Design a protein around this nucleic acid. Sequence first.
DNA 1: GACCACGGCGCC
DNA 2: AAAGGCGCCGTGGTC
Length: 540
Amino acid sequence: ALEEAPWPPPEGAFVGFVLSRKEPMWADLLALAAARGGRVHRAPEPYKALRDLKEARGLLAKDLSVLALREGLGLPPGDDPMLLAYLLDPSNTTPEGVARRYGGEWTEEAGERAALSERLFANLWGRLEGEERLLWLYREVERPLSAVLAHMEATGVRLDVAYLRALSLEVAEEIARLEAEVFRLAGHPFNLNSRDQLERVLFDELGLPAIGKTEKTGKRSTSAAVLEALREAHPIVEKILQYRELTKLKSTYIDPLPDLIHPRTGRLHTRFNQTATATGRLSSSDPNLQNIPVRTPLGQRIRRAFIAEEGWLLVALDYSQIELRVLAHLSGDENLIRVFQEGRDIHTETASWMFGVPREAVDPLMRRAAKTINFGVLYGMSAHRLSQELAIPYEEAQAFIERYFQSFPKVRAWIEKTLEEGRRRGYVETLFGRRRYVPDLEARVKSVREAAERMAFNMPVQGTAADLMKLAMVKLFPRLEEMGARMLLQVHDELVLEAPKERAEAVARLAKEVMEGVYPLAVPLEVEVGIGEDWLSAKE
DNA sequence: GACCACGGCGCC
DNA sequence: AAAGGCGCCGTGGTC
Ligand SMILES: [Mg+2]
Ligand SMILES: [Mg+2]
């Protein structure tokens, strides 16, 4: 096949590499190679050879860049065929799949991976010709974002380990109180972590009424939704609900996170997966830092563990109602656009009609209720499902659905146009032309078809919000470098940065402006910003 | 030790 | 606490 030539490769070569494990912050670089111009070059010693590359160009380029950064080398990621394939079709999420589909095989040898990266890029680049909008997304968003993501991953975030270890002991004792009480109420001990055993106790032994069934295997459900509805049926239910919350938080965050501190950085390093979702969102794994608790009292105590470096502060920026602002722009609805242009709070307007009075002081709970209905109607829930899900008579539900769409006729028209076009072309698109293929828009099984319609009109909204955030990160990153600040985390419509204390206020101002002005829409974008020593404080 | 499907549930 | 989009936990089961 390719001609074998000595290391190092010429500039522009495609790289292949093998890691001992998937997480580049934790991986041993086992082998490194490069392919170009009909030649393949294999590195005698991979870590040393890393020093010869100017760019990581090839499949999974960002992963190699993260390892390089870990080793003190400023090796940026460049072209990556994964990103081309993901823009053609976001179900293209793995190198194994992308290779099979576009002209090779993903193996475990660096030379082969290098040669593969080269051929896949050639082929996929050809596919993106004529695709002007996908090309722009590649050049202006995805390719530059991979470098930003590489820096975020390699930087990591600081965690108060001692605090979490002390917290574990406290939660353990509370969990023991709950499980002892549950077993007494049951009349015998069992495995409270087993939903199958819990099912027998609740519905067979205590004879509580089963309310719902599980999706795939049709067992009587013990989900929080069922338990909430049985809260007053028996005192064991509230205890179980509390046990669920504590064990969830303890097993997922409190116990695992302290063990994941990197020995060299003394920080926690997530992976930001760039080709993992059907809508263009990022995902986070190993550990997932996009789902750190924030709602409950114990969740808030966990979030306080994420702290700024000594002498630095966290800066937290959140887009306000990005998805509804995107929907206003996509649909062109005059009335919805007027809402945002006039700084009015849409969920409060709906809370004036329902729960009113008063317009001035609707109160939190009623607004949360109005929000729930606004989005419910939006996702095409029936007057029946809304009336029963939201403890209100059937008539009220219908009235609100008609009002909602009489106020925003173009939102309805936009949803209808998007579904028809998805059916015809087989895909739907974000504002920037990112695509998702949704085949089941024609299924003859109504539950299947209707689930598809929800996916289909969700994608342009969630996906455009993702495009905007990604473009914002791409724009914001060089500015932070210049100011000596760091970008740490993204959580879909939020960013968390770290800045020296003397510069935190300027960083927050600047970041807020870059985010709000990322790509002007028919409505303003609003960003709320907070500064603090820890992630919870930085929003309070 | 690993994988899996599942139910369940943390976040946006 | 908006929940379509995710990733992780333990169970029960397999290999
Ligand atoms: Mg928010
Ligand atoms: Mg699942």
